[PDB]
Design a protein around this ligand. Sequence first.
Ligand code: NI
Ligand code: NI
Lengths: 238, 79, 569
Amino acid sequence: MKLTPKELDKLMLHYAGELAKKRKEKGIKLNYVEAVALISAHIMEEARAGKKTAAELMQEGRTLLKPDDVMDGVASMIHEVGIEAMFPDGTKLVTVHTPIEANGKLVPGELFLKNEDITINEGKKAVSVKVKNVGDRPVQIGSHFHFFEVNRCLDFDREKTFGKRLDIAAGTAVRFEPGEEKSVELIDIGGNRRIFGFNALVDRQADNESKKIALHRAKERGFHGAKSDDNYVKTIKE
Amino acid sequence: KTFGKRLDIAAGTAVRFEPGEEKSVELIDIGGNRRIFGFNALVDRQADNESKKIALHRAKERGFHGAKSDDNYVKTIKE
Amino acid sequence: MKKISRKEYVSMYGPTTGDKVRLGDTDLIAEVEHDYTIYGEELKFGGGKTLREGMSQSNNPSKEELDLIITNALIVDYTGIYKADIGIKDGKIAGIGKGGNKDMQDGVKNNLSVGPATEALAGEGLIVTAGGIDTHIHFISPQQIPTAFASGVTTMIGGGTGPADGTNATTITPGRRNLKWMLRAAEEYSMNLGFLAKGNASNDASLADQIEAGAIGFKIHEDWGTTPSAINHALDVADKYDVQVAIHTDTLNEAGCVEDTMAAIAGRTMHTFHTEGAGGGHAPDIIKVAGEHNILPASTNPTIPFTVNTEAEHMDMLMVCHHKDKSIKEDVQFADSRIRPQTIAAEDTLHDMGAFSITSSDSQAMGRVGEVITRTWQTADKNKKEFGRLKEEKGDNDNFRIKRYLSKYTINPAIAHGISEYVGSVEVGKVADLVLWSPAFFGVKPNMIIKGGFIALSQMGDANASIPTPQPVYYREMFAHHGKAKYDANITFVSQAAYDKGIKEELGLERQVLPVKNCRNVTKKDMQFNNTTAHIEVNPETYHVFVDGKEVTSKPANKVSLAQLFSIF
Ligand code: NI
Ligand code: NI
């Protein structure tokens, strides 16, 4: 019966679920491991039966255990239980979000933040810019992307955003639906202000002179808002 | 008019131009193999009538006063 | 736990936290910011003192045992001004803190353990700083070395082949053969060395070969033709080999103006020598460059500080040089379009503002390789006397300003030439190039120069006397200056490329040979306490200097400190 190593993985999980249930049967507050295995073993069988759809099990899994069935802490712990099973249409990923509820105090590793607000990008005075997505597709820019070089679709005053980035929490971004128009905040880039990569519009020291070159480049490359060519005076290298 | 030429003066000397000043300078043609490399990067090759075309075109775009004009340039396969 | 007065304590271990020292005969007052010792356990060497068997000196040292301890030294460095013991092992600064014998004293890291193998150097009452690093040297004459050395400088970077006109005019050692001669010659001296090659070439092949040959970087100079071509080509190859580039601007503006030179540089890193202008460069607005981000501004020794005599002096040097005449107008014009007393005085202040970052010499060619340190402090003294203390200054001292200038000839030149990791500041892990200063003579005449963890030069008296103090007392070569010891104590710098190609074994170089690195990712913002950028203009008519709108200038001086007071000549 050529059992794959994946199959053995599941066969083991199942008896971890079986144990899990048999314990609840005897009436015993399940724990992190037991709760998860149980939820997992369950979904597994249901997919075997070929009845419940993937979409349905996502939920039905949230009714396998009630707050009084588990130990305090378990709820705050099992944020979610992902699991794969073979449906008549093949294996599919079922994610049972928050299966049980926090009917108790104890919360492992809980955080005790201190109400107050972190002030991001200290002293980097932002600037607002009118931006509109003239294209027919979406466009989302990251927090540290040289704004001046985003999709050539976003129309706006390129000239004004040279050497700047979206003044937002590191790692996040701003979305622009086709047609949408908004005003974004953008501070200047820190460090050595050495802009290399992106759209290849700068690739050097970001200064007022490099700027001239950047606009000229964007201009010829079709980046909406890229000012204009009021007669360029090409340097010895660019 | 001064392509491939240099100030016809004693080797090592120079001619000064005060801001505003205007003068007429003498200039003979460069000797040797007339291989112009360096300077402002306007030539960097054999100095001939063809390289000239390229030189003026280059100076033109680089803003060198007097650099004739772009009466529609016909870019070569390498320049 | 009986206690003792401050006056006493300080005559045994030197100044402690909160105390202040006057630097030489200047008005610059430094304050001990911190002290790592433990009052009662401080280290002392002597007849019945603390550094002895079983006591301060361990009989069970750690297997890191030091080779040398500088006791109770006051460390003046861009990293701070404090009190602490310095531990030295294997030519490197192994530790900065308490140190002594853990067997008999609390708090003593094992990288500071004192055992029978460690030597003792008293530092109480003295100030310890890193060796100086002059990066604008003309290898005109080998006699410069022992001069720069006696002045607290342990590292010289520049170019040349001896008293040859090319060298007298520029800091360049051209071609791999001449690079060979110099590297092999360097074996002889007591001073880390690095050489710059001829960047005045639009030939890429010739450009990289000099690096592959041993050069730590290029030098573009006027006399060789500092054109936008040469400039552009050099820089590119410089980017590949992660090596530095120095430059002397096109004074005659023949190829273009400072605007063009910059466009040439294309925003890449650059070490600008004598950015002011007197030492040479675009007439008359070259000094403006020292405000750009991608620039590493450096000033040349001569016009520093600005004295009532500096203007007259220079006109002479510029005339004695270049072959200028008083009766010829074009000759008087060039002289006036280069020796701007305006941009000169504007300098002293630019340094004070953090606008300028490095202080060079320009030895044997409009520079005094023996007065870089002395003059760096004189200038600081003036600016305080004329502008007062600093806004950034915290407390009743000049600490901040102090670090500002120190960095100018230590950590800043070190970074500008990729050798910051090994030298350039009193920090753990770096080569032990330290110079002990006796507070009174600070900035002028140092007590002793320790090269590579061992004493190489020190004040020495009658070699026949019963002690080292009696006269005559001049600077005598010490042990790290002789035999095979010099080789262990010195370093000749090279590029990664050469280092990798085995340039050391290649040339039979018996000296420690390291390669320079991180030269292409540095900007004006990498210059310690001298990271101020700014859009500075320069009046074409009055040669007046303007920064961020306003204008800067300093007043000349009739007298300077660290001068006639200390030398018989
Ligand atoms: Ni120079
Ligand atoms: Ni020089």
